[PDB]
Design an enzyme around this catalytic site. Structure first.
Site, mmCIF file in Angstrom:
data_model
loop_
_atom_site.group_PDB
_atom_site.id
_atom_site.type_symbol
_atom_site.label_atom_id
_atom_site.label_comp_id
_atom_site.label_asym_id
_atom_site.label_seq_id
_atom_site.Cartn_x
_atom_site.Cartn_y
_atom_site.Cartn_z
ATOM 1 N N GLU A 1 2.919 1.486 -3.391
ATOM 2 C CA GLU A 1 2.183 1.973 -4.552
ATOM 3 C C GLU A 1 1.749 3.412 -4.374
ATOM 4 O OE1 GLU A 1 -1.384 2.525 -5.082
ATOM 5 O OE2 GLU A 1 -1.923 2.339 -2.971
ATOM 6 N N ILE B 1 -30.769 -16.823 -5.078
ATOM 7 C CA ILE B 1 -30.837 -16.575 -3.642
ATOM 8 C C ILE B 1 -31.477 -15.224 -3.363
ATOM 9 C CG2 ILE B 1 -29.399 -16.239 -1.576
ATOM 10 C CD1 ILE B 1 -29.729 -19.134 -2.449
ATOM 11 N N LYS C 1 -19.771 18.772 -22.876
ATOM 12 C CA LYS C 1 -20.881 17.971 -23.380
ATOM 13 C C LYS C 1 -21.386 16.961 -22.343
ATOM 14 C CE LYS C 1 -17.507 16.713 -25.461
ATOM 15 N NZ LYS C 1 -16.065 16.944 -25.177
ATOM 16 N N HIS D 1 0.824 -1.209 0.000
ATOM 17 C CA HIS D 1 0.000 0.000 0.000
ATOM 18 C C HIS D 1 0.858 1.258 0.000
ATOM 19 C CE1 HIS D 1 -3.624 2.358 0.939
ATOM 20 N NE2 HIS D 1 -2.918 2.977 1.868
ATOM 21 N N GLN E 1 -22.174 -14.872 -3.763
ATOM 22 C CA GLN E 1 -20.769 -15.249 -3.728
ATOM 23 C C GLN E 1 -19.870 -14.048 -3.475
ATOM 24 O OE1 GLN E 1 -19.275 -17.056 -7.316
ATOM 25 N NE2 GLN E 1 -17.171 -17.173 -6.534
ATOM 26 N N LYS F 1 -22.951 13.243 -21.021
ATOM 27 C CA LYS F 1 -22.595 11.869 -21.322
ATOM 28 C C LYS F 1 -23.743 10.896 -21.142
ATOM 29 C CE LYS F 1 -18.316 13.638 -20.427
ATOM 30 N NZ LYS F 1 -18.092 13.853 -21.872
ATOM 31 N N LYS F 2 -24.932 11.376 -20.790
ATOM 32 C CA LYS F 2 -26.079 10.536 -20.483
ATOM 33 C C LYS F 2 -27.326 11.357 -20.723
ATOM 34 C CE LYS F 2 -24.138 7.588 -16.828
ATOM 35 N NZ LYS F 2 -24.214 7.192 -15.397
#
Lengths: 940, 949
Positions: free
Chosen positions: A66, A293, A851, A63, A318, A853-854
Site C-alpha cells: 500500500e 468502568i 477562514k 504495508h 473494550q 473552522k472553529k
C-alpha cells in the site's frame, strides 16, 4: 462488474450532503458523498485484506504494497509522479493498513477527482512495484520503525502480540523493519516484488473494497463515472481474513508479567480476551462498559483510590480484536504506596466487579447514555474530508450502507445477558497481569524479539488466587447519580447592533477589560471563553512560580472528581499559569458556565489543603524538575531560546533547588496575599448577548471582591517583559552539553524588528521560499539528520527567525553547511524569476488567507493578539495588500544589510546544544548587564 | 597702638600648628596660627560691636555696614575689587552679624596672605559707601530677609525678640529690611551713609576686635608682618556694650503663647531666662545640665515620655544670649494625647526636676562626662581653615591667649551650689510657654509685625499654676547609670605588609562582599564602616517598601534608648532604607564596634512590634505622605527628575494609598520572609586589621544565618535599575502645577553618555565654563530668581547634565532665556583663548586634585564607587591624564552633535513645574505632553549597565 443497489439514506439531518450506498459485483462497496459546498473533494478505498494476511516470513507485505501501489503505472512509471500529481492539486493523501483492513484515502484541489482516478485505475490493471521506489520506500519503512523505536506503546503492543500464541497469525509483525522486509527474503531468494504482485493480484484485485468518495460533482455523474471505471477489479472470491480462536489460550492467562520501561513510568495493565459483539453493535454493551468502568463519581472506585492515594489515573474498556474474538483492556497508573497493596488494588477491582454484579444491569443509564448519543449525534459540528471517509469505509465492510452513519450512536436493544456475560468474563480465571515498573532489575529475562523489552511470569501465589476468588465484596461503592449539566439552551441568538467581524470592547475598567463577539459564521449553541489574570507575584521568585504551579495544579485537581460530570456533559476548560499570570479557558454550552464557573471561582477563592496530597504533588513537580535534565534537545534549545530573549528568567536548576524550602504555611499564607490585589482580563465568544456577558462578568468580579477583596493594579505595575537589544552586528555563541542523547543540537536566532507590515511579509516570504529548498537540499539531499527545522519566532512584539537541526556533528562544521545553504539561498534570490516569485507569493497568499473552522481557533488568534495587546484585527488584509507591493529586488534590500555575511545590521546569535560527549557566552547575567533593551510596541 | 604679649599656648596635643596670642593696644585681640604645611591660608576678624548696639531708627546698620565695608577702598575705589581679588585666587570670604559680634573672615589659595590682607587693611582707613553698592546691597539685605521670611526658626526667634521687654535693646530688629535701611531714614531726611560713617568712626576704631590669621610662614615673620601692617586702627576707648538686664521682666513670665507656624508642625517651647554663667566657664555647669536634662537613660524622663507615647522628640538646655543674661530652653514635639495633656507633660517636667532635687548633684557623672570631653578634646583630627578661625576668634574676645584653645573642653571644679542654684532658678515662677500648632484657628489674634505669625496670650488659670508649684514629685525616675561605652582603645596599629592605598576585596561570598583599608593618614583610634544590604523584595510595591520604612524606623527607635549613650560616647551610625535594601553605617572608635554592632544585628534580626508605637509611626509617616504637596518647586522638580530618570518609580499618591491596608500580622509575617534571603556589600576603614575585619564580618553574617536562616542571593537576582534611552533627537516636556507656590519651576536634562574618561572631562569642563557666565548674566544681571542651578548628573553609570531653575516666569519664556544663554555660550566657545582654556582647566585640575580631610570623607567617595560597583580607584589621575589632552575644537565637536540645536544626538528633555495660577527665541521643535509616563517610556529603549572596573 457494474452493480448498484441503493435508496434514501438516513443522513443525520444537520448535514446537507446527500448520500447513497451501492455494492459492485467485484467486491467493491460504494458509498456516495455529494458535497457541492466543499472546497476540497476527497475519496477513500478500504481493502479488508489486512496485515494479518501477510506471509509469516516477510513482515509488512501489505504495508509495503500500500506504500508501493501508488508509485508506478503503465501510464506513469515515474517515481514520484502520482505524488507529483498530488503536488499539483494541493491534495495530501495518506493510506494505512490494519489487521483487518488496508485502507486508502486521498483528497484533491477542487474538482480534479477524475485526474486522480486516471492515475488510480491502472493500479488494478498493471501495478509495477519498480526497483527504485522500492529501495527508497523500504528506507521510509525503516525510518518508520526508527521513529517508532522509542514509542513504548508499540513495544508493549507487540509484546501483547507476541506473548499470546506465537503461532497464531495475530502474532505477526505488522510494519516490518529493513531486516525483515528486505534482508531475510532475498538472502532466501524470495523476491519481495513477486510477493507484491502475487498479493495484489490474488488478494487485492479480487474483492473486499469499500470505496467512498466525497465529491462535489453530483450524485450521478461521479457514480456512473467510477462504477463504469471499476470493472478492472475482478471477483476471485478470496475469503475474508478471520480468526476462529484467540491467541490467549491459558498459557498467559492467570499470569503476571513484569515489564522494564524505557520511560520513567509506573503502570499495571490488565487484558481480557472476550467474545464477539460485532453482531451486538446494535445494543453495544461495550459502550456501557466504557461508561461504567471508567466513571469517576460519587461512590466510584477512583474516588476511593484517590481518597486512598493509591491510583493517580486509570483507563479501561473494550479493545477491538479480530473478527472472531475481541479484547478488554484495563490500564492504570500507579503510586508509591500501591506497591505493597497491588493485590489489594486488584481486590478493589474485584470489589467493583461485585458491585456491578450486585446491582446487575441498569436501564436508566442505558436510556440516558442513548440520549447522550442522540444529542452528540445531532450536534456533530463538521467533518474532516480526510480520515472520516477512511473510518466510515473501515466500517462500510461490517455495516449496511444505511447503518454506516448510524454507526454506533443509536441503540436498539437492552442486553443484560451480554453485560452479565462480560462480567462473567471479568473473573480471576480470566486475568492477565502486566506490571510496568523501573525497579525490575536482573529479574526480567525473557526479552522481546523485535524491540527488546523484558519480562518474567512470576505466577500468582495461592494466597492471592484464593483472595481473588473468595473476596467478591462491597466497600465504598455506590452507583453513580445522574449528571446535572445537560443543557436545553440551543437557540441561536441573531446578531444585534454589535455587527463586527472582531470582538469589541464591551467593558473596560481599571479592574477588568472585556472583549466580545457573537458567532457570525458557525451558529453553534456553544460558547468559548478566555481569561487573563494578571499578577505581580508571578515570576518574583522560583518559589512563587513553584507556588503558582503547585497551587493551580492541586487546586484544579481538587474539584476534578466533581468536574468529571462536567466534562461528561461536553464542557471543556483549561487552567493555566504564565510568567505574567494565570490563564483560564471555558469551552462548551451556554447552560451552566455561569453557575459552574462561579462555583469554580468560589472554589479557588476559598480553598483548603490536604497534607499528603501536597506532598505527592510536591514530589511530582520535583520529579518533573529532575526530569528536565533528560528531554529532547530541540526542547532544550527552545528553552534557552525563550530563556535568553526575555528580560529576566529563573533557571530550572534553581527551581529544582528551591523546593527544599517550600512549606505549606508559607504557601497558605501567600495565597490571600496573592489574591489581595490583581488584574483580570477576559475574552467572551459565542451564543450569548452583550448585556448577559456584562452580567456574567459582574458576577465573576463581584465573587472575586467578595471572597478575597481584589483591588486593581497600578498601570505602572501592569508590565510586560521586554527583549534584549544586541549591538546590531555581532554573532555570539556558546555551548551546552546534553546527557542522554548522543545527538547535538543547535539553533540560530535573528533579531529582525517589531511586527510591522513590512517585516511580516519580509520574514514570512523569505522563510517560505527557503522552506521547501531546505527540505530538498538539507534533509533530502544532504541527509544531515532527521530533525531539521526552520522558521519564525514571534515574541515580545518582536519578530525572529529560528533554525532547529539536531545531528551528531561538530557544531561549527554544521554551521559551515548552514552558511553554505545560506549562500545557496542567497544566490537563489537572484535565481528567482518572475514566475517563481508569483507562484510563491500566491503560496504565501493562500498560506495567509484562510477562514477559521472553529470558534476556539479564531478565539485563539484574537487572544494571541490580546496577550500581545495589539488588536490589529485586519493585519491580514493590510499585510496581504502590502504583499503585492513587494518585489524580488525588494528582498535583496532586506538581504544586504540585515541578512548578508558582510551585513552591518546582521543580528545573529547561535546556541550550541552539544552531544552527550565570535565570542563565547560565559555569564547570561553579564550578557544582559551591558546590553540595551528594546522599546515596546505601540498597541493598536 | 602695636602691643604684643605671648608665650607657649596649650594646643590640644595632636596639632602641629604653632600658636601665639597677643593683644594690641588699639583693642585688637590677636591669635597667630603658623602652619607651614597648609594648602590654604586664612584669616578672621570679629568685632564685639554687634547688632544690639545699632541706632534705634535704622535696623541692621552694623549689618549693612559690614556688607558695605567690603566695597570701596581709597586704593581701589572700584566696587568689587576686594571681592574680585579673592575671586582671582580662590579665597572664599564670608561675614556675619550677631547681637554682640560682627565677624569677618577670608582665606587665600596658597600664599596670597599679604595680597588679600593688604586689600583688607584699607577697609579701616577708607570705606567708600558709594551710590550703586549702597543701592544694590540694600536690595541684597532685603532679599536676604525675604528669603529668611519662611524660615520658621527665625520667625520664632524674632517672636522671642519681640515678646520681651520692648524697651530693652533685645527688642530691636537685627537684620533690617529695605524699609528700615532706606525707607525710614530718607523720609526722616537721615542720610544712611552719614550714619554709616558716624557708626564706623565712633564705635569701630576704638576696641573690641578679635583677629586671627591662619598663616603658613612662621611664628615671627608673619607676626611683624601684620603688626607692622596693623597699627592703622587707633583706640578711642568705646566701653564694652553689655546689658544689666534681662528682657523678660515679669511682663511675659508665667505666661502662655499659641503660635501659628508656616509648616505643619506641633511643638511646645519652654524658656527660662537665666543669669550669666559666662564667668563660670571654668566649672561650666550648663554643659552638665544639657547632659542631664536631655539624657536618655534608665528612669529618665524621655524614657517615660516615649513609654507613654506622648513625645516624639525633644530638645532642652541652656540657650546662650547676651552678655548680661542667658537663656534656658526646652523644645518638645507634640502628639495627639500630648495635645490634651500639656499640663501633664509639664507635670512630667516637674517630676524630673524633683528627681534632680531629690538626688541633688552628682560627681561621678561630672567626672565621667568631663573625662569624655577631655579625651574628645585630646584627640582631634583636622579643621576647616575657614569658619574655625571665626569661631575661635569669637572666643578670642572673651578669653586669655592660653584659654582660647582650652576653651570649654577642660573643667577645673565642681559647683553643686551652682547646680542647686539654677535648680532653684528652674521653677514655675520662671516658666515661659510657647505652643506651636497650625491647628490654632480663630483663636490667635496677635499677628507678628515683620513675619506675620499669629499668637494669643491665653493666660494660664490659677489651677494649673498651683498645680505647677505643688506637684514636684517623683514617679519611676532613676538616675541614669554609668556608661560602659567609654574606650581605653586608643592604640594606633602599625601598618602591615598588606600595604594598599585602596580597599581590597578581602572577603567575597555569594552572601557577602567585603572591602577594607586601614587608616594610613589620620592616625586615629576611630574607624568608619559602611554597609549595603541588598534585597529583592524592597521595591516590589509601595506597600512593602512602606513596610520596610516603618520597620527600619520603629526598629531604630527601639534600640535608640540604648544607642543614646553610644552616640554620646562617640559611636555614630546610620540605618536607611533604599529601593534596593537597607543602608548601614558604623562610625566611631574601635572599642565596641563588634560588641555594639553584634547587638545591633541581633536586635534587628529578632525584633517585635508594639501596637501603639506602630500606630504613631503609621500616622506620622501617613502625615509625611501628604506633606509632599507642600515643598519647594525645585525639590519637586528634582523629585520628578529622580522619578523619570530611573527604571521604575512609585509616586506619592500610590505610596500614600498603600498604607490603607497595613495590618500588623501582614507586616510581621512579611518581615522574616523579607529578611529570609539577602546580600551584603561592605566597606570598612579605620584603625583595625584585615583578619579582625574578617572576624567582624564573619560574626555578623553568622549571626544573620543564626537568627533568620539567611541563604545567599542568586547572581541572576543581583540587579540594578536601568536608565531610559531617548530617541536621540527629541525634546519633550510636560508640566506640573504647584498648589501653594506662585513661583514656576523648570529643569532641563541631557543624556550625554556613560562615564568614559573623555566624557567626564567634557562635562566637567563645560559645566565649569558655564558656571560663571550663567552666574554673571542670568541670576545677577537678568535677576531671574534665587533658584539658578546647573551641573552634572552621574546616575546608573550614565553621565548627565542638568539645570535647576525656579523663578516667576513663563516656562517657555524662561526656556527662551536659557537658550539665549546657550547661544551666548556657543559664541563663547570661539571667544575662548588658549589662556582662558589653560587657566580654566588648571582651575578644574586643582578642583579635582585634593587629599581628603576626614576618614569618613574618602569613605564616602569609595562607597560612592561601591554603590556604582566601579572601583576605578585611580580614576582621578586618569581623568587628569585625559584633562591635559583637550582642545578648543574638541569642545566644538562636543558642542555640535551633542549640545547644539542643530544636532543629531539631541538628548534634551525639560520638565515644567508651574506656578499656582500657571531676549530672542528661535523656532523650537514641538515637544509632546506626558500623560502616562509608563506609556511614555513604552516606546523608549533602555540603556545598558556598566561592565565593572
Amino acid at each position: 462488474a457494474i452493480k448498484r443497489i441503493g435508496n434514501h439514506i438516513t443522513k443525520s439531518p444537520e448535514d446537507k450532503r446527500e448520500y447513497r450506498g451501492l455494492e459492485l459485483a467485484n467486491g467493491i462497496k460504494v458509498l456516495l458523498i455529494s458535497d457541492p459546498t466543499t472546497d476540497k473533494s476527497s475519496a477513500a478505498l478500504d481493502v479488508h485484506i489486512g496485515s494479518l494476511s501477510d506471509p509469516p516470513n516477510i513482515a509488512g507485505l501489505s504495508h509495503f504494497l500500500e506504500h508501493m501501489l501508488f508509485l508506478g503505472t503503465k501510464k506513469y512509471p515515474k517515481e514520484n509522479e502520482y505524488s507529483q500529481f498530488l503536488s499539483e492539486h494541493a491534495g495530501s493523501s495518506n493510506a494505512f493498513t490494519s489487521g483487518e483492513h488496508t485502507n486508502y484515502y486521498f483528497d484533491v484541489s477542487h474538482e480534479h477527482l477524475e485526474g486522480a482516478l486516471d492515475r488510480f485505475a491502472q493500479f488494478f490493471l498493471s501495478p509495477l512495484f519498480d526497483e527504485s521506489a522500492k529501495d527508497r520506500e523500504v528506507n521510509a519503512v525503516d525510518s518508520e520503525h526508527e521513529k517508532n523505536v522509542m514509542n513504548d506503546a508499540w513495544r508493549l503492543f507487540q509484546l501483547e502480540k507476541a506473548t499470546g500464541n506465537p503461532k497464531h497469525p495475530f502474532s505477526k509483525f505488522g510494519t516490518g523493519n529493513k531486516y525483515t522486509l528486505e534482508t531475510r527474503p532475498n538472502q532466501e531468494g524470495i523476491d519481495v516484488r513477486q510477493e507484491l504482485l502475487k498479493f495484489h493480484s490474488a488478494y487485492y484485485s479480487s474483492n473486499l473494497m469499500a470505496v467512498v468518495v466525497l465529491g462535489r460533482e453530483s450524485l450521478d455523474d461521479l457514480t456512473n463515472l467510477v462504477v463504469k471505471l471499476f470493472s478492472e477489479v475482478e471477483n476471485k472470491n478470496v475469503p475474508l481474513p478471520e480468526f476462529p480462536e484467540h491467541p490467549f489460550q491459558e498459557e498467559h492467562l492467570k499470569q503476571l508479567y513484569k515489564i522494564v520501561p524505557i520511560k520513567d513510568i509506573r503502570n499495571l495493565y490488565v487484558t481480557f480476551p472476550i467474545p464477539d459483539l460485532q453482531k451486538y453493535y446494535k445494543s453495544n454493551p461495550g459502550h456501557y462498559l466504557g461508561h461504567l468502568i471508567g466513571h469517576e463519581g460519587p461512590g466510584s472506585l477512583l474516588s476511593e483510590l484517590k481518597s486512598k492515594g493509591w491510583v493517580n489515573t486509570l483507563v479501561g474498556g473494550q479493545k477491538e480484536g479480530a473478527r472472531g474474538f475481541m479484547f478488554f483492556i484495563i490500564n492504570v497508573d500507579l503510586t508509591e504506596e500501591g506497591l505493597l497493596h497491588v493485590e489489594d488494588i486488584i481486590l478493589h477491582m474485584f470489589q467493583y466487579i461485585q458491585k456491578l454484579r450486585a446491582e446487575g444491569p441498569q436501564e436508566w443509564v442505558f436510556q440516558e447514555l442513548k440520549d447522550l448519543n442522540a444529542v452528540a449525534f445531532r450536534f456533530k459540528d463538521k467533518e474532516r474530508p480526510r480520515g472520516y471517509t477512511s473510518k466510515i469505509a473501515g466500517i462500510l465492510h461490517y455495516y449496511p450502507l444505511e447503518e454506516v452513519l448510524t454507526a454506533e450512536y443509536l441503540l436498539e436493544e437492552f442486553r443484560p445477558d451480554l453485560i452479565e456475560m462480560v462480567l462473567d468474563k471479568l473473573r480471576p480465571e480470566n486475568v492477565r497481569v502486566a506490571i510496568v515498573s523501573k525497579s525490575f532489575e536482573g529479574k526480567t529475562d525473557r526479552t522481546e524479539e523485535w524491540y527488546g523489552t523484558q519480562y518474567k511470569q512470576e505466577a500468582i501465589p495461592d494466597e492471592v488466587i484464593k483472595k481473588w476468588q473468595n473476596a467478591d465484596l462491597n466497600g465504598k461503592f455506590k452507583l453513580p447519580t445522574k449528571n446535572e449539566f445537560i443543557p436545553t439552551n440551543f437557540e441561536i441568538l441573531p446578531l444585534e447592533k454589535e455587527a463586527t467581524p472582531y470582538p469589541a470592547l464591551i467593558k473596560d475598567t481599571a479592574m477588568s477589560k472585556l472583549w466580545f463577539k457573537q458567532d457570525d459564521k458557525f451558529f453553534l449553541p456553544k460558547a468559548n471563553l478566555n481569561f487573563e489574570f494578571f499578577s505581580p507575584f508571578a515570576y518574583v521568585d522560583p518559589l512563587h512560580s513553584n507556588m503558582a504551579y503547585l497551587y493551580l495544579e492541586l487546586l484544579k485537581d481538587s474539584l476534578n472528581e466533581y468536574a468529571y460530570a462536567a466534562e461528561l456533559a461536553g464542557l471543556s476548560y483549561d487552567l493555566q499559569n504564565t510568567i505574567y499570570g494565570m490563564y483560564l479557558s471555558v469551552k462548551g454550552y451556554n447552560d451552566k458556565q455561569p453557575i459552574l464557573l462561579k462555583k469554580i471561582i468560589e472554589k479557588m477563592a476559598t480553598f483548603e489543603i490536604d497534607e499528603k496530597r501536597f506532598e505527592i504533588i510536591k514530589e511530582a513537580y520535583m520529579r518533573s524538575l529532575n526530569n528536565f535534565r533528560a528531554e529532547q534537545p530541540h526542547q532544550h534549545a527552545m528553552y534557552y531560546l525563550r530563556l535568553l530573549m526575555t528580560e529576566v528568567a529563573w533557571t530550572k536548576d534553581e527551581l529544582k533547588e528551591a523546593l527544599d524550602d517550600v512549606t505549606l504555611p508559607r504557601l497558605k499564607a501567600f495565597i490571600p496575599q496573592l489574591l489581595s490585589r490583581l488584574h483580570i482580563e477576559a475574552l467572551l465568544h459565542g451564543n450569548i448577548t452583550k448585556q448577559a456577558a456584562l452580567g456574567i462578568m459582574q458576577m465573576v468580579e463581584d465573587t472575586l471582591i467578595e471572597h478575597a477583596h481584589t483591588k486593581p493594579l497600578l498601570p505602572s505595575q501592569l508590565v510586560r517583559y521586554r527583549e534584549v537589544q544586541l549591538p546590531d552586528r555581532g554573532w555570539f555563541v556558546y555551548q551546552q552539553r546534553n546527557e542522554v542523547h548522543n545527538n547535538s543540537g543547535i539553533e540560530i536566532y535573528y533579531q529582525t524588528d517589531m511586527q510591522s507590515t513590512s517585516e511580516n511579509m519580509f520574514l514570512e516570504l523569505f522563510a517560505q521560499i527557503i522552506s521547501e529548498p531546505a527540505f530538498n537540499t538539507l534533509r533530502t539531499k544532504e541527509q544531515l539528520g532527521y530533525i531539521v527545522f526552520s522558521g519564525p519566532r514571534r515574541a515580545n512584539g518582536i519578530q525572529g527567525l529560528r533554525f532547529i537541526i539536531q545531528s551528531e556533528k561538530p557544531p561549527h562544521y554544521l554551521e559551515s553547511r548552514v552558511e553554505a545553504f545560506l549562500i545557496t539561498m542567497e544566490k537563489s534570490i537572484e535565481d528567482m524569476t518572475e514566475e517563481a516569485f508569483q507562484k510563491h507569493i500566491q503560496a504565501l497568499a493562500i498560506r495567509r488567507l484562510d477562514k477559521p473552522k472553529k470558534l476556539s481557533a479564531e478565539s485563539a488568534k484574537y487572544w494571541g493578539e490580546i496577550i500581545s495587546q495589539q488588536y490589529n484585527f485586519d493585519r491580514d488584509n493590510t499585510e496581504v495588500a502590502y504583499l503585492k507591493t513587494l518585489t524580488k529586488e525588494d528582498i535583496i534590500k532586506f538581504y544586504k544589510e540585515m541578512l548578508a555575511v558582510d551585513a552591518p545590521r546582521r543580528h545573529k546569535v547561535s546556541v550550541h546544544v552539544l552531544a552527550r560527549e565570535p565570542e563565547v557566552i560565559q555569564n547570561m547575567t553579564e550578557f544582559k548587564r551591558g546590553l540595551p533593551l528594546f522599546p515596546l510596541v505601540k498597541p493598536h
